[PDB]
Design an enzyme around this catalytic site. Structure first.
Site, PDB file in Angstrom:
ATOM      1  N   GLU A  35      -6.570 -19.923  21.179  1.00 54.69           N
ATOM      2  CA  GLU A  35      -7.042 -20.346  19.865  1.00 54.69           C
ATOM      3  C   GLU A  35      -8.577 -20.393  19.763  1.00 54.69           C
ATOM      4  OE1 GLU A  35      -5.465 -20.639  17.021  1.00 54.69           O
ATOM      5  OE2 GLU A  35      -3.390 -20.640  17.706  1.00 54.69           O
ATOM      6  N   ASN A  46     -10.225 -18.382   6.702  1.00 55.44           N
ATOM      7  CA  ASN A  46      -9.151 -17.460   6.356  1.00 55.44           C
ATOM      8  C   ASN A  46      -9.399 -17.049   4.900  1.00 55.44           C
ATOM      9  OD1 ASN A  46      -7.474 -17.911   8.887  1.00 55.44           O
ATOM     10  ND2 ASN A  46      -7.524 -20.017   8.082  1.00 55.44           N
ATOM     11  N   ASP A  49      -6.371 -17.206   2.119  1.00 55.92           N
ATOM     12  CA  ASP A  49      -5.879 -18.416   1.469  1.00 55.92           C
ATOM     13  C   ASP A  49      -6.928 -19.518   1.291  1.00 55.92           C
ATOM     14  OD1 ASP A  49      -6.107 -19.612   3.961  1.00 55.92           O
ATOM     15  OD2 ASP A  49      -3.997 -19.952   4.255  1.00 55.92           O
ATOM     16  N   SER A  51      -8.552 -21.384   3.499  1.00 56.76           N
ATOM     17  CA  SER A  51      -8.466 -22.517   4.399  1.00 56.76           C
ATOM     18  C   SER A  51      -9.290 -22.187   5.652  1.00 56.76           C
ATOM     19  CB  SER A  51      -7.002 -22.809   4.747  1.00 56.76           C
ATOM     20  OG  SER A  51      -6.441 -21.809   5.584  1.00 56.76           O
ATOM     21  N   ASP A  53      -9.738 -23.005  10.011  1.00 59.53           N
ATOM     22  CA  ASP A  53      -9.162 -23.561  11.234  1.00 59.53           C
ATOM     23  C   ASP A  53     -10.330 -24.175  12.011  1.00 59.53           C
ATOM     24  OD1 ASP A  53      -6.532 -22.608  10.704  1.00 59.53           O
ATOM     25  OD2 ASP A  53      -7.135 -20.629  11.361  1.00 59.53           O
ATOM     26  N   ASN A  60      -5.647 -26.450  10.997  1.00 57.42           N
ATOM     27  CA  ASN A  60      -5.850 -25.999   9.616  1.00 57.42           C
ATOM     28  C   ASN A  60      -6.132 -27.035   8.525  1.00 57.42           C
ATOM     29  OD1 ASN A  60      -4.488 -24.793   6.878  1.00 57.42           O
ATOM     30  ND2 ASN A  60      -5.552 -23.213   8.018  1.00 57.42           N
TER      31      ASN A  60
END
Length: 130
Positions: A35, A46, A49, A51, A53, A60
Site C-alpha cells: 500500500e 483517486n 471518485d 477521494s 488514500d 480512504n
C-alpha cells in the site's frame, strides 16, 4: 516516516495487530508493504471518485477518515485524515482495526487480494523477533 521492515513488525505487534479479527501480523505487513512501502506520509488521490488514500495503510477519505473535500463522505473511523500522516502509527492502527470490523475484513483493500492473499507471506516478518 519510512519504517524499516522489522521495526514496523514489532510496532504493530505491540499495538495488538497480531491476530486481530483473524488477521496475522504477516498479512498486515504484506498490506503496508504494497500500500505505501511502509511510508506514513504516503497519499494517493483517486481522480475518478475524488477521494484520497492516506498513510501507511492507505485509508480512504470517503469512509474512514474526514478530509472535508471528499463528496459523499462519511466518518466511520471518526478521525481527521491528517492523523494518518503522523510518524506515530497509533491512529492509523486504530483506523485499520475499524476497517476490518466490517464483514469484508482484510479483503477491503484490493491490493491485499492481488499481492498477499493465498501467498507465502512469512517473508514479511522473518527475522524480526515477533
Amino acid at each position: 516516516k519510512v519504517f524499516e521492515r522489522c521495526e514496523l513488525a514489532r510496532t504493530l505487534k505491540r499495538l495488538g495487530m497480531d491476530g486481530y479479527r483473524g488477521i496475522s501480523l504477516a498479512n498486515w505487513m504484506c498490506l503496508a508493504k504494497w500500500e505505501s512501502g511502509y511510508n506514513t506520509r504516503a497519499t494517493n488521490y483517486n481522480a475518478g471518485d475524488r477521494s484520497t488514500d492516506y498513510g501507511i495503510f492507505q485509508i480512504n477519505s470517503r469512509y474512514w477518515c474526514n478530509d472535508g473535500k471528499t463528496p459523499g463522505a462519511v466518518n466511520a473511523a471518526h478521525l481527521s485524515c491528517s492523523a494518518l500522516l503522523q510518524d506515530n502509527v497509533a491512529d492509523a492502527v486504530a483506523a485499520a482495526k475499524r476497517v476490518v470490523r466490517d464483514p469484508q475484513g482484510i479483503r477491503a483493500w484490493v491490493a491485499w487480494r492481488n499481492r498477499c492473499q493465498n501467498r507465502d507471506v512469512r517473508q514479511y516478518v522473518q527475522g524480526c523477533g515477533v
